[PDB]
Amino acid sequence: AVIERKEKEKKEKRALGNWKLLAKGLLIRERLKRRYGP
């Protein structure tokens, strides 16, 4: 049970890191669109 909980916690940490990476990427792209809009 402890091992399964630790694996789930690691997966959740990976998901949070991926969410953080996605937020930065979308903010960067939105900033590019704002600064280079037609």
Place this chain on the structure above:
Amino acid sequence: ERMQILQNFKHNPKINTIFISKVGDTSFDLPEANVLIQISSHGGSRRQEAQRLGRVLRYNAFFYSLVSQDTQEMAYSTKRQRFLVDQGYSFKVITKLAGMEEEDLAFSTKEEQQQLLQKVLAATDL
């Protein structure tokens, strides 16, 4: 890193030139040097220039100061040498360098010179 760089600077014939960014403006253990070339120093700090001149003496040696004409650097260099002239030093003005085109130097053509404009204006620290 600074300690080892300065330590191998003196007892190495392969490398004998280093660049310092305002770190040598105090009393350190820098080894004996014969040539000093200062570029874009502080505004009017006579103390800084006097200290930098002090890092060479210990014509055994000679130091050069590079400034840009028609800019504030001219006035800065004029106003920051008044201490050394009172000390008795005289700054000879050199307008031509012998053998400038004798060998190849950087920024030989206009292409890289104009390319430098984009990277020097790329700061945009706003």
Place this chain on the structure above:
Amino acid sequence: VLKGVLIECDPAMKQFLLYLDESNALGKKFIIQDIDDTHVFVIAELVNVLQERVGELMDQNAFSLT
């Protein structure tokens, strides 16, 4: 044809005059024709203000010891 005064100097001062033309520092575009990288052609009726501006630029970054 154009009548005026040819001014020959270093490229630095030539481009300084070019900047003064576009910046309207004298009130108009009297820097009419540029002919060479080190030569310009300027109307002669306001050479005095150009001389004053050049002198101000020269002695601004001079730090006169007086």
Place this chain on the structure above:
Amino acid sequence: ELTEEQKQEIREAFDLFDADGTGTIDVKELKVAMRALGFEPKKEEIKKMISEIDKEGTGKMNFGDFLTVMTQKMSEKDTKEEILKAFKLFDDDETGKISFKNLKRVAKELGENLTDEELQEMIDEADRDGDGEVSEQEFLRIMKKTSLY
């Protein structure tokens, strides 16, 4: 700094349901008041916001609470508009979903060195309904719980 002129609009909206000048308006009329100012809340959101405003079971809210709720709703509305614009930019093919190809193309355009395995892990972690990608609602949900914005 929240607004200067829209505050008067919120004052007028509050006074529309407070013609008697009692200082408070009925909680049941919250849905209409939002629609007067352009908001389009849903039943679940309406119930959730009614529960928060009426924890004490008074049934009436003063001007301060109504103004705070309206300001929060405006902030969330502009945030959701920016989120939808970001989704549309991400969904350059107007497919309605941020698929694997869209995420990979955006990552390559941004210059990131993200591996395709991490991209598919993100897609799987972005899948709540099991459709194999991330929709508008899931993007809104993750933007709600984002680290910062």
Place this chain on the structure above:
Amino acid sequence: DKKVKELRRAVRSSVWKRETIVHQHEYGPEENLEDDMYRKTCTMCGHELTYEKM
């Protein structure tokens, strides 16, 4: 915040190429004055160029 700020400007300062506006004076039709005087007015900045044509 610092690690996103240090890279948000790397792409910001990448696309812009021409900062100096093209000052080339696109003069319109010449206006004929007295004593064979011809004046050209720039359509972009209003620069006036007066000359005598032989």
